Nucleic acid binder design. Structure first.
Lengths: 86, 205, 62, 393
RNA sequence: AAAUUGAAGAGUUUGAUCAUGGCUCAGAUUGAACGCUGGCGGCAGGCCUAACACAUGCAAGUCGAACGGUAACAGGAAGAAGCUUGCUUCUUUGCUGACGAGUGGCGGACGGGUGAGUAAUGUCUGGGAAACUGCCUGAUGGAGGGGGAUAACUACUGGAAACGGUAGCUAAUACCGCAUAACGUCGCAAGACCAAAGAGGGGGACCUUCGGGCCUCUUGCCAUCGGAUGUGCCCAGAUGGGAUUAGCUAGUAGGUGGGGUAACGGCUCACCUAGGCGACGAUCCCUAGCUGGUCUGAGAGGAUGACCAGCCACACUGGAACUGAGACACGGUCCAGACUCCUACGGGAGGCAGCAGUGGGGAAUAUUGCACAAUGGGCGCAAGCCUGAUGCAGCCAUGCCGCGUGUAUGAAGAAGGCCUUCGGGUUGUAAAGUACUUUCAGCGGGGAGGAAGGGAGUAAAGUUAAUACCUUUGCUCAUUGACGUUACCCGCAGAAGAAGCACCGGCUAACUCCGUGCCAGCAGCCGCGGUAAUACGGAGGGUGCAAGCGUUAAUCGGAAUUACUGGGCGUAAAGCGCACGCAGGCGGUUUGUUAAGUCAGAUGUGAAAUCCCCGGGCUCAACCUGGGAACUGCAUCUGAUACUGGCAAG
RNA sequence: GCCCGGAUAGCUCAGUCGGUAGAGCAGGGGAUUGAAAAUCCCCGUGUCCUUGGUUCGAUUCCGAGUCCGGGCACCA
């Protein structure tokens, strides 16, 4: 083979590609609030930031935005960072 | 496939009757038995260990009338079979349809019996077999088709079978045009006119 | 390669496109081939009746 | 995937004759140009009178009746061939292939040497069915001098026993019919009026066993090897089993295509040029010395007995006797072959203007039977005409 | 249903002989070709060369039972008009059948093809621990509400075309947030945090815009935990050559911290330490998909992976990324490269290593087959749709086997050929003739099975709404074959249509004549042939094989001719010129103790196919297939300790 | 289909491109031998392109064709 009689499953794929990008980068840049509050030294501001994050940190893997069992390990890693602070 | 050419040619070359072409010449004019073929036929015969092997293999294949591919096949089958290969091959040769038809006097020669088989004549177990290489089973009955009961040569052949001993693994009835293959073909009744070891010794070279 | 050509009658020329099989013939130095008669530009040998499969000459005719 | 030519009415293969400069290619454009307007219904269009590079490239004239068109009685294809002596082979075969010919002369020149050569072919190898066209008439100021220019042609006709005035000799100016002059577009289609009725009509041997003596061969990309030429006899349909005899080993194929003028063909017909695609055939193996045919109807031979007449110098034959041991070129339909000849007991020569029995020995075999015509040639002239009286082995 | 039949010799060195030793060779096999010959049938087989390039066709879609729509087609319905006049035209109407196109879901990543790369972290064999999923399935719970977008379409509009552009409208099982959450998720715990879908069938009652609502039924959805086919990771062993193939590495080795991952690790970033790897083979270069297994041979051993099948890689080339359960992907996307092609010159298109087909290469290869019949596969709620998947005819002596080409009979053998001692001898019962039959092929007629399921109708039972709907099964009769005028059967002449090819010096079975006269050539080796050649060419006769025949190559045997099986070395080719001595190999004898080696034991495993053992079936065979055995080993663990090994003592 | 070149003794080379074609190298016969080599003595080859033509005369000039090498050319 070389060809198929339709091409449309590629265009359904691009429609999906652009609709994933448009909120996968949203959920990934909120993390700057947790890292800036980690950089500010303060455990309480670090936690408030991560508390804004939990809504998006579970939801991104429940939903298709990164899919699979990626929420558990991210939620665990982010607690494991901010518990280094006091 | 069958031997189509001059049949007493073979008998003269192998120095034996082969029980084929069983007719006679008038007043024995140029009856040409007990002499070798051709213009150089007056020569006294000369041997070798390879000549004896080739001539014993020719002998058995001229007895039962079988091709070389057929005999090479039967010898592989014989060697697959348990016991000794020599007797295993001879059992194959004694059970095949055309040969059992000659044995039961339906064909006065091997070629009469193979022609009978070609012409869809024999049913065995009541089911028709038109081919030379069907192995007749123990305790089965061979039966001439009604459209084959008319061959004047077969009705004559069963008279040419009288005062000719028949293998003790079968009986036949001229009056029925039916013969019982009463029991299993028996190596303790019939053999070829050769030594079974020499004819397979040459295959190792 | 040097290649032996069997039986008399030679139709071949210094650009005739031909086939050759093995022909072992240490009698002639280096020769390990034989030129196939009645193939490509090679025709069969003259005045033959004992060969048919050999010499490219075919079965004799009326 | 391609479009289909549909076999309604008969269809016949014709061709121009005469000398160089006379109009032999101008006429074949110009006739096809006015026919597509007048018979076909069209308005004068530039792509009618000029043609594309791609058609010129394959319908090279000298192997193809490169123009195919229709008229009210038959379809016609028409061939353009050299008016010079540098190449005559495809003219002298095209004579045995055509049901008649279009004799072209330019009023400015009169007849020239190849106009005197090509007229003999309809007696010698082909058919005496010739229709005539006088080109560049518009240049001559006087009709009564045009008539004296034309009186050369009535003499030439009468030289080879064509009726000098009961032959139809149309007046025209083919370069003016081509471009779109109102008078000369109106003085070309007169020729198709005579062509539809002078033959009087073509007739096809389509009841008979199939015989295609191959003229020429092509290599179609993606589909393989096509052999083409006038079908002399019989009929074809797509998927018939076919036999090739001649200069090669006898072989069997399947005709797996059948076309004419690069269009699909419901049926290959006798008396017309047809192309055939063939199963298990390579452009490497096949030769023009082949004949495609109905299986087991004709077989190759190199040797034959025949009757042959030696021309007289009247017809442009010999004046010297024709000796034994000669090496003439023979002509059979689409194909030429050379053979060495022999004369009867104690005959060293046969005189010009006499018939003899001859035995030939060709330098390669072709498929042959009795009743098959030939001519012999020794170069500068045809020197005899004859018929195969029986084959030899 | 267990089990073997398997092991060779021959020609050739000299005057002669023994021993040594090469060479030639009989046999088997190949996806083999060549040249001659050729009738019939089964089943099997057809690039094994250029991963060299392909014209043209045809090959993954599908669902109206997710949604908006109504182009096409028919219908109904209604309107309007006419003697087309109780039948008919024109129109309208998503109203219904229905469906072009659009939106949307699931699957296209499967099958099929190719074997280029790759001596491989891939593969094979056997195990290890930190993993995961289409979809099926167990179990438990759930389904709140709202918004937003936009194609089809509408209008407007550019370009030769590809390609479209501008602005407007709006639906969902589509899109998105919120709501709301477990045995869920994270957090040591407090606590915090996360989801989602409907659709469709149908009825008594009940609302009602008569649309719809409510109900029930069925089917689908979502969340979460389990199971399961499937898949990933890791680890040991095993995996061609070159050592005239001796160094390789920090881009590593080891660690620590972070990052990243489904999970795991220099995966990856950074630091710190300096290590890691190699001559029991790092490194480097050469070759090469593997394996089950196929062939050959007593087997060992060798060759070997092909036809089929398990696994792997690849799809004109090079880079990257993505959609998603899953894919730098064959059928897809961006970009680049090369070639080729179209073009209105502005611009664009494409990759048979699917299937059939073609050119080219080469020693050498089917028909742009046929088909819904049956099987698998994808979507399909089902009817249905898809499929070059699948099945099956064609072409060809390419493979294997079976069958026939007449047979029975038949001479003063008569012609003829051949040889001759000229008597005869022989070809040869061969021919003619006589007798019989037609198998096959032919012509004509008849004609099984591959067909199960599936359609509709209908009955009873169950599900349930008292009720439909829905469903399980039964019954009625409706219906389905490409191959195909089938397999097979029956009639009917009639021997009618069916033998060629190589061989005859020896090895090697087959002899005589004639010509040739070291010539033609002749063999594989030894050799032959220089005018009384079974060695040449022809002739006849003989041998052998046969619808095949010979010949060439290739592989394996013979070979023990690299000798474990199974060798020599004073001198047949051959023992180091000598010593010393590390590496490595090897080590007396006795006591105890140990158990790595060895040995016994058990359990798990190496599928199919292949072989074996024993059947079955297609008439037999080829062919197909069942059951039973087979699988030398590996993993893990239990027992023994004579012996070799270890450790300790003497 | 078209265009170009090649047809002197086995080989080579010459020869008024019309007027018995010459020489060399090699070869054949004889002698010698069972044969060959070698030697010694005698002697031949020309498809002087096939085939048709031009002429007073073809080896040599002109057409035709066959084979062989090379060029040009097409894809129903």
């Amino acid at each position: 083979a070389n060809i198929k009689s339709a091409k449309k499953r590629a265009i359904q794929s691009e429609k999906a590609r652009k609709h994933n990008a448009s909120r996968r980068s949203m959920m990934r840049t909120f993390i700057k609030k947790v890292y800036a509050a980690i950089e500010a030294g303060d455990k309480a501001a670090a936690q408030k930031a991560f508390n804004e994050m939990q809504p998006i940190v579970d939801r991104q893997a429940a939903k298709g935005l990164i899919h699979k069992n990626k929420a558990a390990r991210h939620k665990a890693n982010l607690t494991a960072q901010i518990n280094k602070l006091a | 496939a069958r031997y189509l050419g001059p049949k007493l040619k073979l008998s003269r070359r192998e120095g034996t009757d082969l029980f084929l072409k069983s007719g006679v010449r008038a007043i024995d004019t140029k009856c040409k038995i007990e002499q070798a073929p051709g213009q150089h036929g007056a020569r006294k015969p000369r041997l070798s260990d390879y000549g004896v092997q080739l001539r014993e293999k020719q002998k058995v294949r001229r007895i039962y009338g079988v091709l070389e591919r057929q005999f090479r096949n039967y010898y592989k089958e014989a060697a697959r079979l348990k016991g000794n290969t020599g007797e295993n091959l001879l059992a194959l040769l004694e059970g095949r349809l055309d040969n059992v038809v000659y044995r039961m006097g339906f064909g006065a020669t091997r070629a009469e019996a193979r022609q009978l088989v070609s012409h869809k004549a024999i049913m065995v177990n009541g089911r028709v077999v038109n081919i030379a290489s069907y192995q007749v089973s123990p305790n089965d009955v061979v039966s001439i088709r009604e459209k084959a009961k008319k061959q004047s040569r077969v009705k004559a052949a069963l008279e040419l079978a009288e005062q000719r001993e028949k293998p003790t693994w079968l009986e036949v009835d001229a009056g029925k045009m039916e013969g019982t293959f009463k029991r299993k073909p028996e190596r303790s009744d019939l053999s070829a006119d050769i030594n079974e070891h020499l004819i397979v010794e040459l295959y190792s070279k | 390669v040097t290649s032996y050509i069997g039986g008399e009658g030679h139709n071949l020329q210094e650009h005739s496109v031909i086939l050759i099989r093995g022909g072992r013939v240490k009698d002639l130095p280096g020769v390990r081939y034989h030129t196939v008669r009645g193939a490509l530009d090679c025709s069969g040998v003259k005045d033959r009746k004992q060969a048919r499969s050999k010499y490219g000459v075919k079965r004799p005719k009326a | 995937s391609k479009e289909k030519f549909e076999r309604t009415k008969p269809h016949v293969n014709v061709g121009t004759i005469g000398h160089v400069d006379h109009g032999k290619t101008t006429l074949t454009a110009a006739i096809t140009t006015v026919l597509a307007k007048t018979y076909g219904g069209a308005a004068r269009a530039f792509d009618q009178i000029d043609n594309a590079p791609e058609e010129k490239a394959r319908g090279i004239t000298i192997n193809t009746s490169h123009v195919e068109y229709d008229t009210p009685t038959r379809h016609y294809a028409h061939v353009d061939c050299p008016g010079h002596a540098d190449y005559v082979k495809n003219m002298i075969t095209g004579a045995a292939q055509m049901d008649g010919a279009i004799l072209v002369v330019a009023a400015t020149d009169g007849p020239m040497p190849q106009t005197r050569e090509h007229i003999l072919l309809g007696r010698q190898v082909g058919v005496p069915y010739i229709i005539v066209f006088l080109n560049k008439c518009d240049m001559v100021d006087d009709e009564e001098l045009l008539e004296l220019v034309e009186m050369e042609v009535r003499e030439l006709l009468s030289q080879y026993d064509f009726p000098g005035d009961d032959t139809p000799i149309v007046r025209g100016s083919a370069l003016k019919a081509l471009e779109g002059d109102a008078e000369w577009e109106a003085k070309i289609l007169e020729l198709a009026g005579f062509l539809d009725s002078y033959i009087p009509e073509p007739e096809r041997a389509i009841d008979k066993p199939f015989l295609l003596p191959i003229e020429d061969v092509f290599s179609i990309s993606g589909r393989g090897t096509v052999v083409t030429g006038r079908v002399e006899r019989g009929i074809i349909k797509v998927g018939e089993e076919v036999e090739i005899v001649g200069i090669k080993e006898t072989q069997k194929s399947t005709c797996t295509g059948v076309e004419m003028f690069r269009k699909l063909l419901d049926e290959g017909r006798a008396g017309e040029n047809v192309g055939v695609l063939l199963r298990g055939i390579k452009r490497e193996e096949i030769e023009r010395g082949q004949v495609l045919a109905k299986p087991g109807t004709i077989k190759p031979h190199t040797k034959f007995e025949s009757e042959v007449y030696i021309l007289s110098k009247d017809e442009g034959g010999r004046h010297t006797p024709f000796f034994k041991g000669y090496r003439p070129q023979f002509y059979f339909r689409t194909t030429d072959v050379t053979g060495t000849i022999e004369l009867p007991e104690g005959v060293e020569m046969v005189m010009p203007g006499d018939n003899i029995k001859m035995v030939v020995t060709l330098i390669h075999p072709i498929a042959m039977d009795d009743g098959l015509r030939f001519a012999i040639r020794e170069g500068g002239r045809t020197v005899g005409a004859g018929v195969v009286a029986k084959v030899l082995s």
